[PDB]
């Protein structure tokens, strides 16, 4: 009983450790913005 249970539990822990290693260890326009800011600043100037 003790040996079977211990061996199976050890194997399961080993599998989880492998999966954890798998997850962790594996290392891997501008012009439109111009008129956008121009309209924003002129709108604020008018509204201020």
């Amino acid at each position: 009983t003790m040996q079977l249970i211990k061996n199976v539990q050890d194997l399961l822990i080993l599998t989880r450790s492998i999966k954890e290693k798998w997850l962790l260890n594996q290392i891997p326009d501008e012009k439109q913005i111009e008129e956008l800011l121009d309209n924003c600043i002129e709108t604020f100037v008018a509204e201020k």
């Binding site: 539990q9 399961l12 822990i13 989880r16």
Partner: protein, 169 residues
């Protein structure tokens, strides 16, 4: 049919000790009515012979101390077989007999006397009688193992496991 082992069998005879009392003189007389005293032993045959005649280290110490013990040899040397003889005595409460069987091998070529071979152990403690240590040891060990099994199964029931920690309580 369930039989209590004779090794643990203990006889008490309050009437006999009340009437006669405990003494080395009648210790064999006390033993006579017990179940352990076989009726086929030559001691009983000697007893009927005496009755019919009337109608018509410490071993050497107890050897030389009593004359009835002498008469026991000179009446027992003639009859070979299962016989009851005293082992040792310390007064006024402790007596033990020696349970041996005799085969008087008078054949040619044997310079030794009659062969004496043990058969059983008997201890007279007070008014009580007691009659293998291997069995005692194995019984104690097996009961210990049973208790250990109970404790370990209870402890394993108490055990709780989680993958992220191991086993805890």
């Amino acid at each position: 049919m369930n039989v209590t082992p004779l090794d643990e069998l203990q006889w008490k005879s309050p009437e006999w000790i009340q009437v006669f009392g405990l003494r080395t003189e009648n210790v064999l007389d006390y033993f006579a009515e017990s179940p352990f005293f076989d009726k086929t032993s030559n001691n009983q045959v000697i007893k009927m012979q005496r009755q019919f005649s009337q109608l018509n280290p410490a071993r050497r110490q107890i050897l030389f101390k009593y004359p009835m013990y002498m008469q026991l040899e000179e009446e027992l040397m003639k009859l070979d077989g299962t016989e009851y003889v005293l082992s040792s005595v310390r007064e006024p409460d402790f007596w033990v007999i020696r349970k041996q069987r005799r085969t008087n091998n008078s054949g040619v070529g044997s310079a030794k006397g009659p062969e004496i071979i043990p058969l059983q152990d008997y201890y007279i403690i007070g008014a009580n009688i007691y009659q293998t240590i291997f069995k005692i040891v194995q019984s104690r060990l097996m009961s210990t193992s049973y208790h250990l099994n109970s404790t370990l199964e209870s402890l394993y029931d108490l055990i709780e496991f989680q993958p992220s920690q191991g086993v805890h309580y």
